[PDB]
């Protein structure tokens, strides 16, 4: 029975990983659940999995759950604050920690797990996008095992040889016969759209997606391919890949989740349904397998699988992400931050769809790059890029 | 560097194997080459790879090869005969044996390599199709390492977990998270041909294929999908898979070479160009990799990838192979033997394309022999199946 702490349990990934536990009760034991304010969900999960501890980052939210679970006859101890969240990730008896908390938060909670040398089911982008170098140095030193939950990175992991999986980010690709990592993406809803028309696309149009049913922020990132840009930054740190060892491909049907090109010409790939329980269950059971409740892929009910090379004129955000990587963590962190601001501004109809790539670029052009030396430095670059971006949005919505 | 013995060196697989070592001279050393009658090719291979021994099946070929090499100043020791071929497969110093001798001829040499506990680069169908249980038991005994060279079996191997790769054939699939083995095939040239027209298809039409570079016999097997039927039989033995754990899928483009379905829903697959150097190099380097000379698969220059379920009314040989497996090695051995006869008959225009499956079935219905218990027993079933097949062909042509 693997002991696990779930960081961000009430979210989509959180509830999904919990469903995998349901399907395999004798395989996993929930030791701790961590969340933000969604007391309701927390209550249900605690009542179902009898966690030893439960924490909410919000003091108030924590008080309600504190008593709500008291009366419910629950014997789970309720705590609160980041400090507590971080302790849950470092519990002596916990084997794995699902790091599903997003944004700047979750950075310290995930780092806490890495420093405790635990197995980390990496389900957040912030870690590698903003602290790529710092986190990979920490995992190497603390000997923690990273197991990527993100569909693409997970497909890549499953398609890699054992020696790289066990020394992720440290092992050399070439020495292990890998020539490159093939990062795949759908290309979004504007894959065919004339370039001239991108500037007038609306939020509803941008958030139009077939495959995965993600939120609006991620749907837009998929339309600009900033999402793939961020996964590119992540992949290089995670798999120890140079620019020439990375290949980005458009695969509209999203059946293949990503692949790995080898020395003898072999290309290994992972295919599946657009259901996160698969990659989640894979990381949870690794190196073994477990039922995830996901229905088997029916090859007789598929659209023809196609591929294409992305055009940077169409996806400038993709190229921006690639360039930001060469500039360091300050750059990628700033790009990520600006993008959060611009996508939100676009969604609020304050700027055009094409203003996202334009403002993201402009923010990076004005930032004073100073490579962070710890997460606190990273957080400062984030806050600073976030402010620079808000002003560009206001400057654009006002007069400029 | 690894020392190898190449069984069937002058053939297609053998030449592809030698190209792989040619690309990695410091990784492999050719210690012994074995062939049949192509003295010409054997001489050039001996001259380039400096093997310790060179073995020809035919004694006359051996003698001719011997005079060729001396005239060229080569000191390669020349031998001849089956026993000699077996000795090459068991040399104490050799690490790997590329089992590429086709047909009944490859049986003893391959078994000799297995008995010697060598790492076997299995590139012949005769072995598992006719001596499935016998050979798989032989492997567990000597604890020899099997590495499938067949494109599909190789693709499946690469998409399997390590505990199965080692312990190939005896490890449990469910235990290791495997739901099923997805065996893919192109469906051949008559994939969309009206069923009514199949009876009139010509050897030339049947042998068309933008696919791989195969002989006419294998070409025909791809149009009847008897090839896939044979791979179904092998895969069952090789991966310790039951009927429910096997899925056969038509994939016209042949970019995906086969796949493996897992419990969490993941499906792992191997893709690549239609070049045997890739899987051969995979087996030779396992668990590492080496350049094979195969160009990288360009995803931007591909036809859309499609899949379909095999229609048995169109591919009766495929259903026939599946049913024969249930019966035993006598049935699979007989089916394989009969098919060689009927396909040759079709190529010589003695029978029609659709008669291949009809006569294959007829032979299995007439025989009903007993479960063989050694190589001589299967060789006997093969012999009998062939004569029954020849009589079927003859009474049909008259
Ligand atoms: N969704 C997907 O399929 C995938 C997502 N990812 C990455 O996973 C992440 C977001 O995933 P998604 O998880 O599904 O989420 P939401 O569905 O966004 O879940 C966020 C969770 O973390 C908790 N949370 C937020 N802030 C804090 C904080 N300060 N302290 C503690 N808990 C906090 C909140 O719970 P509460 O609601 O109670 O506030 C909530 O459970 C990002 O890192 C994303 O880029 C990667 C691959 C696939
Ligand atoms: N081609 C492919 O991509 C694949 C083929 N296979 C399997 O590979 C096999 C045959 O392959 P292919 O190799 O290309 O062949 P040919 O190109 O048919 O090679 C046959 C070889 O073995 C030698 N040979 C024949 N009879 C004997 C004998 N009695 N003793 C010693 N050597 C003998 C003959 O050489 P010589 O010509 O000198 O007589 C020749 O080198 C079959 O077992 C087939 O089903 C499996 C997967 C992929
Ligand atoms: O983990 C899932 N994704 O990244 C999918 C979201 C957009 P894409 O299909 O273009 O990669
Ligand atoms: O090892 C390779 N093959 O079997 C490919 C031959 C073409 P087919 O799969 O359609 O029979
Ligand atoms: Mg993703
Ligand atoms: Mg084959």
């Amino acid at each position: 029975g693997k002991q696990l702490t779930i960081l961000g349990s009430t979210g989509s990934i959180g509830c999904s990983t919990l469903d995998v536990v349901r399907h395999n009760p004798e395989h996993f034991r929930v030791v701790a659940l961590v969340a933000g304010k969604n007391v309701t969900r927390m209550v249900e999960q605690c009542l179902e999995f009898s966690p030893r501890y439960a924490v909410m980052d919000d003091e108030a939210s924590a008080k309600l759950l504190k008593t709500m679970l008291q009366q419910q006859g629950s014997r789970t101890e309720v705590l609160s604050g980041q400090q507590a969240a971080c302790d849950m990730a470092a519990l002596e008896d916990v084997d794995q920690v699902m790091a599903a908390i997003v944004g700047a938060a979750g950075l310290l909670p995930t780092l806490a797990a890495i420093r405790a040398g635990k197995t980390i089911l990496l389900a957040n982008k912030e870690s590698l996008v903003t602290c790529g170098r710092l986190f990979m140095d920490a995992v190497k030193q603390s000997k923690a095992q990273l197991l990527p939950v993100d569909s693409e990175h997970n497909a890549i992991f499953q398609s890699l040889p054992q020696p790289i999986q066990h020394n992720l980010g440290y092992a050399d690709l070439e020495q292990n016969g890998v020539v490159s990592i093939l990062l795949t993406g759908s290309g979004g809803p504007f894959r065919e759209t004339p370039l001239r028309d991108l500037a007038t696309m609306t939020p509803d149009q941008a958030c139009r997606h077939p495959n995965w049913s993600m939120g609006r922020k991620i749907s837009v990132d998929s339309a600009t391919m900033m999402n793939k840009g961020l996964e590119y930054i992540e992949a290089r740190w995670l798999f120890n890949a140079s620019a020439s060892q990375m290949e980005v491909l458009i695969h509209p049907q999203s059946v293949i989740h990503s692949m790995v090109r080898y020395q003898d010409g072999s290309v290994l790939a992972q295919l599946g349904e657009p259901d996160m329980r698969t990659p989640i269950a894979h990381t949870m059971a690794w190196p073994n397998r477990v039922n995830s409740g996901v229905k088997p892929l029916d090859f007789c009910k598929l659209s023809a699988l196609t591929f294409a090379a992305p055009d940077y004129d169409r996806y400038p955000c993709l190229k921006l992400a690639m360039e930001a990587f060469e500039q360091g963590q300050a750059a990628t962190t700033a790009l990520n931050a600006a993008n959060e601001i611009t996508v939100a501004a676009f969604l609020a109809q304050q700027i055009r769809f094409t203003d996202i790539a334009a403002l993201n670029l402009s923010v990076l052009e004005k930032m004073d790059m100073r490579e962070p030396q710890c997460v606190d430095d990273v957080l400062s670059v984030d806050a600073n890029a976030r402010e620079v971006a808000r002003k560009e949005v206001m400057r654009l919505a006002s007069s400029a």
Side-chain angles (χ1 to χ4, degrees), chain A:
Chain A
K2 307 289 287 191
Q3 248 81 296
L4 71 165
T5 286
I6 305 299
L7 259 29
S9 74
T10 63
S12 184
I13 287 179
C15 297
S16 282
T17 101
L18 237 31
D19 193 56
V20 172
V21 174
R22 264 192 289 269
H23 290 69
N24 313 79
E26 259 53 66
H27 283 286
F28 316 92
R29 163 189 152 59
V30 180
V31 166
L33 294 184
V34 179
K37 304 170 182 169
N38 191 338
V39 174
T40 303
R41 263 293 185 167
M42 190 56 94
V43 177
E44 278 309 301
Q45 307 184 317
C46 291
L47 289 177
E48 197 190 317
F49 312 79
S50 305
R52 181 173 166 60
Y53 304 96
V55 32
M56 303 301 283
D57 176 272
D58 190 290
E59 194 62 59
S61 307
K63 178 57 189 303
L64 305 179
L65 177 68
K66 182 188 185 66
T67 167
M68 287 186 84
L69 295 183
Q70 199 302 80
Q71 63 177 61
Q72 295 293 306
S74 172
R75 59 213 203 78
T76 175
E77 182 176 358
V78 178
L79 321 182
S80 69
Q82 198 177 210
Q83 300 286 66
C86 288
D87 291 325
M88 297 305 91
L91 289 180
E92 180 175 290
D93 41 308
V94 164
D95 302 290
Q96 39 182 66
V97 38
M98 168 57 72
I101 288 165
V102 61
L107 229 40
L108 291 179
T110 301
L111 184 56
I114 294 164
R115 294 311 184 174
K118 300 195 183 297
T119 295
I120 305 143
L121 287 21
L122 192 60
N124 67 276
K125 283 186 161 60
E126 288 284 308
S127 293
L128 275 38
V129 163
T130 72
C131 304
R133 169 177 290 294
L134 298 172
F135 277 23
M136 290 307 124
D137 283 348
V139 307
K140 175 186 174 180
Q141 173 170 40
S142 305
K143 275 61 186 57
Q145 175 65 231
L146 296 180
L147 299 179
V149 174
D150 175 68
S151 188
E152 295 86 5
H153 296 136
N154 180 275
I156 296 300
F157 184 85
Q158 292 200 53
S159 300
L160 255 9
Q162 192 129 64
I164 289 165
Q165 295 186 176
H166 281 280
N167 301 285
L168 208 53
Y170 181 67
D172 181 272
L173 291 178
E174 187 174 4
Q175 291 310 295
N176 287 85
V178 170
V179 317
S180 63
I181 288 73
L182 277 54
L183 185 52
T184 54
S186 76
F190 308 145
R191 184 164 45 81
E192 300 290 23
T193 307
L195 277 48
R196 302 168 95 281
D197 300 2
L198 296 183
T200 62
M201 293 294 98
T202 69
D204 276 10
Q205 297 179 303
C207 300
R208 199 168 281 162
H209 46 77
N211 313 303
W212 312 68
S213 61
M214 61 214 109
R216 293 170 75 68
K217 197 287 185 170
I218 302 300
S219 299
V220 180
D221 284 343
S222 177
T224 59
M225 274 194 85
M226 170 70 274
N227 179 226
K228 206 54 51 187
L230 295 178
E231 296 181 329
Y232 171 90
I233 296 166
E234 294 180 279
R236 287 192 60 175
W237 285 125
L238 185 61
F239 304 113
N240 192 190
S242 61
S244 56
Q245 284 168 156
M246 290 298 299
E247 291 187 48
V248 182
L249 281 172
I250 275 61
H251 171 44
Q253 304 77 211
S254 298
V255 175
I256 285 167
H257 296 333
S258 278
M259 325 177 268
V260 172
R261 195 191 294 287
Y262 289 80
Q263 218 184 322
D264 55 44
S266 294
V267 174
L268 260 30
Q270 188 274 3
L271 293 65
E273 296 270 29
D275 185 337
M276 290 308 290
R277 287 177 295 176
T278 291
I280 289 167
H282 158 85
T283 68
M284 287 176 75
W286 183 77
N288 301 310
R289 300 277 182 164
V290 137
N291 173 59
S292 62
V294 173
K295 59 165 178 165
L297 180 59
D298 186 351
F299 287 84
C300 296
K301 291 182 168 184
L302 268 27
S303 297
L305 310 189
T306 66
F307 307 88
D311 172 9
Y312 297 149
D313 287 352
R314 177 178 296 281
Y315 306 103
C317 276
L318 176 57
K319 182 55 183 168
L320 190 47
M322 293 171 154
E323 293 167 352
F325 188 87
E326 297 302 324
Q327 298 178 56
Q329 294 176 299
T332 61
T333 298
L335 211 207
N336 181 64
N339 190 67
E340 276 182 301
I341 297 299
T342 60
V343 169
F346 165 63
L347 290 166
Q349 297 185 283
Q350 310 186 88
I351 71 164
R352 298 166 171 280
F353 171 77
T354 45
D355 286 334
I356 299 167
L359 260 41
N360 287 351
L361 173 64
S362 186
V363 172
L364 247 58
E365 281 174 347
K366 306 194 297 183
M367 293 295 291
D368 180 62
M369 258 59 268
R370 273 295 298 177
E371 293 307 88
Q373 294 310 310
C374 53
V375 304
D376 194 273
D377 284 351
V378 167
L379 297 180
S380 179
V381 172
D382 178 84
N384 273 59
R386 206 171 286 274
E387 191 60 1
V388 174
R390 292 194 187 94
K391 293 185 183 182
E392 300 214 311
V393 170
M394 296 170 82
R395 167 187 56 178
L396 186 60
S398 66
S399 181

